[PDB]
Amino acid sequence: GMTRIASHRGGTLEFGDSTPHGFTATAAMALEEVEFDLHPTADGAIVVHHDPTLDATTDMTGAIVDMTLAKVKTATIRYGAGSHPMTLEELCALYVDSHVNFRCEIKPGVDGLPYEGFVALVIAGLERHSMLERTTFSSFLLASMDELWKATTRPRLWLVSPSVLQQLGPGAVIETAIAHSIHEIGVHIDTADAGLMAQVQAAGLDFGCWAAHTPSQITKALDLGVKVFTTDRPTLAIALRTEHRME
């Protein structure tokens, strides 16, 4: 078939991290998914932002869950020409009329523990704005995968970090997925190879990748024939795939 392309945070290295501009630009592009992360605010809002704090990519400091949607909207995103962080409702508006689908990540808080009651709130929100039926859900945490398995019929994918992959080893990663009724894993592109993909598929699991940001990495994913990869350079990915097909 054809390896799908997911725009990492709207295309971080083209448009900045999680910017209205990058999401808008991604919404009009010739790829299949946009990838993004969500966190709650202290007053029940759902904001699109990678880290659980605002420090790294904005001019404001603090944990998103400790602050109001008001304060979060006062923050300005680095390299985002004046942009503020998006709510989920706002993000949904840009994609309702687009052909590109959602790949949502359930990230934990600053303490690394999952947000209590949030998976439900995200599922409600997406249903309320007519995108749930176009969302694939992802997380590094089995606690979050387990909540998703119980709360939704949408596709679920487990993000397997290099540490987990190396330490558990592929055998145990596969056993753990199967034990949790997880039908797809995503590994860091630098930890992927043909043998690993063989082993994963032989167990009945889909195999995708993440962090394919360079020409080398992007080409590796296409040559390997993975199901999907996230990329901070979606423009180049599309161009490299189009050219890979023909070659």
Least Å from the CB of residue 50 to Fe ion: 6
CB nearer Fe ion, residue 9 or residue 21: 9
Least Å from the CB of residue 37 to Fe ion: 5
The answer to the question of whether 105 is labelled as a binding residue is yes
Reported residue count of the chain is 247
Least Å from the CB of residue 104 to Fe ion: 9
CB nearer Fe ion, residue 188 or residue 199: 188
Least Å from the CB of residue 103 to Fe ion: 8
- DSSP conformation letters of 116-176: TTHHHHHHHHHHHTT-GGGEEEEES-HHHHHHHHHH--S-EEEEE-HHHHHHHHHHHHHHH
Q: Which stretch binds Fe ion (CB under 5 A): 30-38, 61-69, 84-92, 200-208?
A: 30-38
Least Å from the CB of residue 55 to Fe ion: 17
Q: Using CB under 5 A, which of 17, 33, 105, 147 touches Fe ion?
A: 105
CB nearer Fe ion, residue 95 or residue 202: 95
CB nearer Fe ion, residue 14 or residue 37: 37
Considering the rule CB under 5 A, would residue 232 count as an interface residue with Fe ion?
no
Contact by Cβ (8 Å): 55, 85:
no
The answer to the question of whether 35 is labelled as a binding residue is yes
24, burial (CB in 10 Å: exposed 0-12, middle 13-18, buried 19+): middle
Interface with Fe ion: number of residues (CB under 5 A): 2
CA 39 – CA 107 distance, rounded (Å):
7
Least Å from the CB of residue 190 to Fe ion: 16
Q: Which stretch binds Fe ion (CB under 5 A): 19-27, 37-45, 166-174, 217-225?
A: 37-45
Contact by Cβ (8 Å): 192, 220:
yes
**Strand, coil or helix: 65:** helix
Considering the rule CB under 5 A, would residue 184 count as an interface residue with Fe ion?
no
CB nearer Fe ion, residue 33 or residue 37: 37
Considering the rule CB under 5 A, would residue 37 count as an interface residue with Fe ion?
yes
- Cβ-proximal residues to 177 (8 Å cutoff; 6+ apart), any chain: 158, 183, 185, 203, 205
CA 136 – CA 152 distance, rounded (Å):
10
Q: Look-up: residue for tokens 């993440």?
A: 210
Binding-site positions for Fe(3+) read 35, 37, 105
* Residues at the contact surface with Fe ion, assessed by CB under 5 A: 37, 105
